[PDB]
Amino acid sequence: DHYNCVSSGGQCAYSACPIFTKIQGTCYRGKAKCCK
């Protein structure tokens, strides 16, 4: 979720994760990726 994603150092990204990050869970009621 958003709390875990960002508290762990990640980005909530709709659609896709930018280079040097990859999908690890979700944010925003499952509608975005958590990218770390």
Swiss-Prot record:
Principal location class: secreted
| GO MF terms, alphabetically ordered | CCR6 chemokine receptor binding; identical protein binding
Query: Found in which tissues?
Result: Blood plasma. Sperm. Highly expressed in the lower head and midpiece of sperm. Significantly reduced levels found in the sperms of asthenozoospermia and leukocytospermia patients (at protein level).
The Gene Ontology CC terms held by the record are: extracellular exosome; extracellular region; extracellular space; Golgi lumen; membrane; microvesicle; sperm midpiece
Which UniProt keywords are listed? Antibiotic, Antimicrobial, Defensin, Disulfide bond, Membrane, Secreted, Signal
Localization in the cell: Secreted; Membrane
Q: Name one GO biological process term.
A: innate immune response in mucosa
Which cysteines does the record link by disulfide bonds? 5-34, 12-27, 17-35
Which domain of life does this protein belong to?
Answer: Eukaryota
Quick check: keyword Transmembrane in the entry? no
Please describe the quaternary structure of this protein: Monomer. Homodimer.
State its role.
Has bactericidal activity. May act as a ligand for C-C chemokine receptor CCR6. Positively regulates the sperm motility and bactericidal activity in a CCR6-dependent manner. Binds to CCR6 and triggers Ca2+ mobilization in the sperm which is important for its motility.
> Which family is annotated?
Belongs to the beta-defensin family.
Instruction: Indicate what this protein is called per its UniProt record.
Output: Beta-defensin 1
- The organism named in the record is Homo sapiens (Human)
Which span of the parent protein is shown here?
A: 33 to 68 of 68
